[PDB]
Paper text:
Reverse transcriptases (RTs) use their DNA polymerase and RNase H activities to catalyze the conversion of single-stranded RNA to double-stranded DNA (dsDNA), a crucial process for the replication of retroviruses. Foamy viruses (FVs) have many characteristics that set them apart from OVs, including differences in the proliferation cycle and a different domain structure of the mature RT, which, in addition to POL and RH, harbors the N-terminal protease (PR) domain (PR-RT). Reverse transcriptases have two activities: DNA polymerase (POL) synthesizes DNA on DNA or RNA templates, whereas RNase H (RH) degrades the RNA strand of RNA/DNA hybrid intermediates. The structural and biophysical experiments showed that MFV PR-RT is a monomer upon binding to RNA/DNA and a dimer when it interacts with dsDNA.
Numbering used by the authors:
A (entry chain B): 97 to 227, 243 to 365, 371 to 376, 378 to 516, 519 to 578
B (entry chain C): 585 to 605, 608 to 622, 625 to 721, 728 to 749
C (entry chain A): 96 to 571
DNA sequence: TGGAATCAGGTGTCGCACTCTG
DNA sequence: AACAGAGTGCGACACCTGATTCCA
């Protein structure tokens, strides 16, 4: 067993020891515990694990799909990627075999001069049917997808052309349609005996309230994993931290997404105009909306220029209208049979999502989100994308067919496009296509309710 | 064309419409009288009620035409709607030649309003109907837009 | 040793090639000794074929057998030549007399010399066999992506398909009848669908490690700058071919030159361009008379569609003509002939092209006329375009406003620009002042379908592309 | 004045012909 | 009476998107 490059695992261990804010004797015994399991980590780059579970079948498709063409690849990206593919062949997961199917491949540049290969499996995926404590710790799986062996009779689908020769995988391929669900199904009941754990695609999170229980659970989970046959990447994991990142959120002690809404005081005509535009939807179902809204129209009628005089009575009006909208007004019960439709929009400082059923008259539930400084310096598109991510999580949690109404246009373009112009896509569009692959969800653009200028939320 | 310093007066017209709370739209009109430097002499902002933006613009143009008939000396009109001016200038002889009907042989919308525009233009034929749209009239158009919003938001 | 029928004058070939180089006398002596001491590499006989030291390949993957067939009439002229060819093959043992279940026809094909190449028809056999879809043969990408240097060289393999054997149980399909005798192949038979795929896969596998190499089927191309590295890489290639068991012909090969032909395109010190032979062929054409000849002429013209900025607009009436007439007869007019003369004259004034860099961002410049649209490509800091593109507007696109025309041209150019990018950032120069206002464009003004509009707007958020406004060369 | 049924038309899949390179 | 690859075009159906038009 010889790799090509060996990572500085000792330095990462030292960094983890210092980064974890525990007692010094706690640190030393934790270091001893980590050291006693030295074979745990993949000190070799692209080191792959193994599973002894029976191989899975993934060629459940009934109609034969057509092959796809390939285009030339950059000379600069060739050396490193060739070393990677050679190592993968050496691991035995890849073999040289001749098959009917070919899959387009192309590289993308990493932050450094290195390149990363990606495989476009849209054609294949088209025709394959599917089926809180104070102490925190997070572990992750390094290329766990390459742990599930594939049946021999189903190997021919994943072949692709590199250096003029076909190559065939033996484990679950990256970016495949049903692969993440299958991997999650095995990993979740791999630990069905230990409560309090939380697994998502690749990361695994545990929470404890003491130190001894934390040590005991860590030792137990490590033994279970070593029995299973998986390997962990120390670089991307962290533990024993009061704050941690997971599911795109930051976790404090003992949530972030709320239901209060509320708005700070207006200062300009633009803010009041935007607020009126935002609340213009409410007239569809609120009978006494006109009486409450008349003071706002009176205020805008008399006012001139950008100077305004909004007394505390206007504050009482807006607070009352918010309470009336939110408390129990027309909030109907959800329908299981009806497909769920969600409409979302983003503000320069916050965002708002709404849920209906079959285009129902009344909202089902509300959502909100506050932008921290980290994303406050981001592009608007990134803000709206992360809000859409959070909204999709909530919607699938409350799910059944799902529809989304967003200012995004690229989503619907990617969802439906004829074959002759497939070509390639960006580094994040594949991550979102991971959702876009499943036809149970649809995306739409309507250009409704612009909110370029609005007051932020309260403190 | 002759400079603005020769005509008796210039009229600045603008209309806006906004979605309303079982009421579809609320529309206001703003028209200012100027007599020539630039001196916008006086102002009129009027709401209409439940109609689209085009109804507001056409009501504004008849308002301007009737006050121009109240005004002595050839005058000019400027608005934010080039479509109406182009259509009238291109189809007026046909417009009162075919009996106030379109190319589809159907009475086009705003029948009485179009009749008023036509008779006002024909009785006072020395009037200028133009539309420029960054120039001098930008400020006048901005205040007229503000006036139209003020009219629309009145109720 | 080996004794074929016709002995070839190898010394004459070596003298001709060494005399045809641009090297000096000492360099010529070095190359002469290099070629001499690797004398085993080249063929010394007619129909000389090699052998490969690899495990065999099995093509017998079919499930149900087809029905054998018989031979139809044979051309009289080639009969002694084909008989000699078959006898020579028998001498080398490539073809063996043996009766099998299957039988396949024979068909001679004329060759540049008095000889005839051997080709066979496998219709039912190809119908009943699964296909290998490994795509590793794209001529256009190779000719648009190769690196150009001062001293160029190429090598062409000969009789390559005859050097890769087959498994013992899979040979029975290759059976065929000759003069009442049944014969079977030993190696990959030419005319078989998977044979080119296997051959190209093997050949590209050989030359992985050698830097700056372009490989296509039976041809290897490369250019370098100085004599020392060129000789080093050439001798390394010769050694790898020697261990590979392949064989090389002088006549089809040439090395150490300044201008050379490749895939029908002449590469020179300035860049790639057309050859004299194709110019002669196009200059010797006449007025078409039938639909078949018309389609052929237009295909020859379409072959070189990327050597002139304004190709598409002139050829359009000719394309419209074919739909007008029915069957073979075509209604010709003098104006069409005028168009033909104009096209051939424009081709006679064609200019050469350039290569595409892999280290610098690509640039595209686009413009629109009331009837057509023009697209050109460039590298950063360069002035001579890589290739030209032109689009003709259809009847539906005629009603579009000028912004719609510019935008549809934008899409129809970036559709291939994204392919040509090869991961590099893309900068666009257009006569449009801004794009945020384009997003701000209201709906009452536009007329085209919203389905086109959303596709057009999709390009705004691509992180890999940008835009720039420049007021240069306007038209209307 | 506005609102929704019927209907003519653009976009997409798949078929055909021809060329060249080998 | 041949294949693989590439390039371009044209042509007959399918399916839906938008406009015309009648009616409240």
């Amino acid at each position: 067993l010889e790799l090509t490059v060996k990572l500085p695992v000792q330095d990462f261990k030292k960094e983890l020891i210092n980064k974890a804010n525990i007692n010094n004797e706690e640190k030393k015994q934790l270091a001893k515990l980590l050291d006693k399991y030295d074979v745990l980590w993949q000190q070799w780059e692209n080191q792959v694990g193994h599973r002894k579970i029976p191989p899975h079948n993934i060629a459940t498709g009934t109609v034969a799909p057509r092959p796809q063409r390939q285009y030339h690849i950059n000379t600069k990206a060739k050396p490193s990627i060739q070393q990677v593919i050679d190592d993968l062949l050496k691991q035995g997961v890849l073999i040289k075999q001749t098959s009917v199917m070919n899959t387009p491949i192309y590289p993308v540049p990493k932050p450094d001069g290195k390149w990363r290969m990606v495989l476009d499996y849209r054609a294949v995926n088209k025709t394959v049917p599917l089926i809180r404590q104070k102490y925190k710790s997070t572990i992750d799986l390094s290329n766990g997808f390459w742990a599930h062996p594939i049946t021999k009779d189903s190997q021919w689908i994943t072949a692709f052309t590199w250096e003029g020769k076909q190559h065939v995988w033996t484990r679950l391929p990256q970016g495949f349609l049903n692969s993440p669900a299958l991997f999650t199904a095995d990993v979740v009941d791999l630990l069905k005996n230990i409560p309090g754990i939380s697994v998502y695609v690749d990361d695994i999170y545990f929470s404890t309230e003491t130190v001894s229980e934390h040590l005991k659970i860590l030792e137990k989970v490590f033994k279970i994993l070593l029995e299973a046959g998986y390997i962990v990447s120390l670089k991307k994991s962290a533990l024993l931290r009061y704050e941690v990142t997971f599911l795109g959120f930051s976790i404090t002690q003992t949530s972030e997404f709320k239901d209060k809404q509320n708005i700070t005081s207006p200062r300009t005509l633009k803010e009041l105009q935007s607020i009126l535009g935002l609340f213009n939807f409410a007239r569809n179902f609120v009978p006494n909306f006109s009486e409450i809204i008349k003071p706002l129209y009176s205020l805008i009628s008399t006012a001139e220029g950008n100077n305004i005089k909004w007394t505390s009575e206007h504050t009482r009006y807006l607070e009352e209208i918010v309470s009336a909208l939110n408390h129990a007004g027309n909030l109907e019960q959800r329908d299981n049979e009806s497909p769920l439709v969600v409409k979302l929009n983003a503000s320069p400082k916050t965002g708002y999502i709404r849920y209906y059923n079959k285009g129902g008259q009344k909202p089902i539930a509300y959502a909100s989100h506050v932008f921290t400084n980290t994303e406050l310096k981001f592009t608007p598109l990134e803000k709206l994308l992360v809000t859409m991510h959070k909204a999709l999580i909530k919607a699938i949690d409350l799910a059944q067919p799902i529809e989304v109404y967003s200012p995004i246009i690229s989503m619907q373009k990617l969802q439906k496009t004829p074959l002759p112009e497939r070509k390639a896509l960006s580094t994040r569009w594949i991550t979102w296509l991971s959702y876009l692959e499943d036809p149970r969800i649809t995306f739409y653009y309507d250009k409704t309710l612009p909110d370029l200028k609005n007051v932020p939320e309260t403190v | 064309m002759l400079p603005i310093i020769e005509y008796a007066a210039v009229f600045y017209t603008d209309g806006s419409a906004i979605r309303s709370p079982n009421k579809s739209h609320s529309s206001g009109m703003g028209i200012v009288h100027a007599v020539f430097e630039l001196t916008i002499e006086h102002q009129w902002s009027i709401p209409l009620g439940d109609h689209t933006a085009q109804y507001a613009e056409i009501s504004a143009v008849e308002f301007a035409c009737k006050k121009a008939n109240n005004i002595s000396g050839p005058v000019l009109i400027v608005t934010d709607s080039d479509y109406v001016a182009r259509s009238v200038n291109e189809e007026l002889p046909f417009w009162r030649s075919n009996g106030f009907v379109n190319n589809k042989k159907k009475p086009l919308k705003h029948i009485s309003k179009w009749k008023n525009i036509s008779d006002s233009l024909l009785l006072k034929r020395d009037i200028i109907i133009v539309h420029e749209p960054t120039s001098i009239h930008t400020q006048g158009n901005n205040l007229a837009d503000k006036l139209a919003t003020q009219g629309s938001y009145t109720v």
